């Protein structure tokens, strides 16, 4: 197959700044015609895709002139030479000369803003949840950019990835950060056997992981 | 209008076989192809096949799955996908093409979700701090919606009032039973001073929990 290799996976934007995003085929996407059937689709949160640029170039028709498409062969280049608040959504590169046909994994068009650390928050289970036999571990990390964050656990000193679940929102509206939550799930008969519970978060903006604790047998 | 209206959201069984629809309307419907796509959640599209009347095609990834059949007479094409796993969780899209055009139409997609799951109403726990967050400007409190299915909850707090410093996160499949968690955070002026309330609504159990954050 020819796999369609989009970079970067994600591209922070200013509004009214250009984007360009790249695709490059593991082949060349020259069809024996002699066409390059190379095509951009911006897809939004919860729509179809929506097609942008056909044969490398050209744009769909309503497709506004802020979009090009150029290259040649296996390496091509979207560029949005405004980006409006519209535009934002993954833009997927797609080649139509070769079967199977395929897709790249898809850029977003994250909107860039100042780093920002995450605050972090620990909450041990809370009575209720211990009374039903589980204990749920949850770590917040709000509120933090770049999106690139790592969350690790510590028990008692020792990292634990068995039992976690990490979620994550999407670039917030307001304020163009993210946010996650870490969640620990024992049993309470584990919870009970260990006494420090650390959520640490390692971000771009420190050095050090970011670590809140608390202490089972403290309140 | 040229549209192309696919079915509706399917929950089926693992191991069940469901068949989605793609009916085409307001073009020729013999002067394209259909295309059929999946999305996987966070992921790309993945090509499917084709099905066009005396010329199907599927991605080799999904010759033992799919099956596309295509009724010209209604104008309607099916994608019937069997032995289904969670796996196969995805949002299917059906798409036109024809020679010399690309995807130009496509349908709205229908999410698929896999599970053996009966409905069940979330347990809702209050996260409140440990207690050492009680200096800060700002306190965050959260709820736990653990153990729910299917989809959606909806996550209020102080029953809409607390818009702000609101993070709901995505929910996560634990144990074939979904889990969300919602934070907010209030002024330490606000809390416990004033009641804090998260508000839990499952439609599909008809159920809403409104838990109190009360300090631990």
């Known amino acids: 197959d020819i796999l369609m290799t989009q970079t970067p996976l994600s591209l922070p934007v200013s509004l009214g700044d250009q984007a360009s995003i790249s695709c490059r085929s593991s082949?060349?996407?020259?069809?024996?015609?002699?066409?390059?059937?190379l095509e951009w689709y911006l897809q939004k949160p919860g729509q179809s895709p929506t097609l942008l640029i056909y044969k490398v170039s050209n744009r769909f028709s309503g497709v506004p002139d802020r979009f090009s498409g150029s290259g040649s062969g296996t390496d091509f280049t979207l560029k949005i030479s405004r980006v409006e608040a519209e535009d934002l959504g993954v833009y997927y590169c797609f080649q139509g000369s070769h079967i199977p046909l395929t897709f790249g994994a898809g850029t977003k068009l994250e909107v860039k803003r100042s780093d920002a650390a995450p605050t972090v928050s620990i909450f041990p289970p809370s009575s209720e949840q211990l009374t039903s036999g589980g204990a749920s571990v949850v770590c917040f990390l709000n509120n933090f950019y770049p999106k690139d964050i790592n969350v690790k656990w510590k028990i008692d000193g020792s990292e634990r990835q068995n039992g976690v679940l990490n979620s994550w929102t999407d670039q917030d509206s307001k304020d163009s950060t993210y946010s996650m939550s870490s969640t620990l799930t024992l049993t309470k008969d584990e919870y009970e056997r260990h006494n420090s519970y650390t959520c640490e978060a390692t971000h771009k903006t420190s050095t050090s992981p970011i670590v809140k604790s608390f202490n089972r047998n403290e309140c | 209008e040229v549209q192309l209206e696919e079915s509706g959201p399917e929950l089926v069984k693992p191991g069940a076989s469901v068949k989605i629809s793609c009916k085409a309307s307001?073009?020729?419907?013999?002067?394209?192809?259909m295309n059929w796509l999946r999305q996987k959640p966070g992921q790309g599209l993945e090509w499917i096949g084709w099905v066009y009347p005396g010329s199907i095609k599927y991605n080799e990834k999904f010759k033992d799955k799919a099956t596309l059949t295509a009724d010209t007479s209604s104008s309607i094409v099916y994608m019937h996908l069997s032995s289904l796993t969670s796996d196969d969780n995805a949002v299917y899209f059906c798409?036109?093409?024809?020679?010399?055009?690309?995807?130009?139409?496509w349908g709205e997609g229908t999410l698929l979700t896999v599970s053996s799951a009966k409905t069940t109403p979330p347990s809702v726990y209050p996260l409140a701090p440990g207690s050492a967050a009680q200096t800060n400007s700002m306190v965050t409190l959260g709820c736990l919606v653990k153990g729910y299915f299917p989809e959606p909850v909806t996550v209020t707090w102080n029953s809409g009032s607390l818009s702000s410093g609101v993070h709901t996160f995505p929910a996560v499949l634990q144990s074939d039973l979904y889990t969300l968690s919602s934070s907010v955070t209030v002024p330490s002026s606000t809390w416990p001073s004033e009641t804090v309330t998260c508000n839990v609504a499952h439609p599909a159990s008809s159920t809403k929990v409104d838990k109190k954050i009360v300090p631990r």
């Open positions: 307001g073009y020729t419907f013999t002067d394209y192809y």
């Open positions: 082949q060349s996407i020259v069809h024996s015609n002699g066409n390059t059937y």
């Open positions: 798409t036109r093409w024809t020679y010399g055009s690309s995807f130009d139409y």
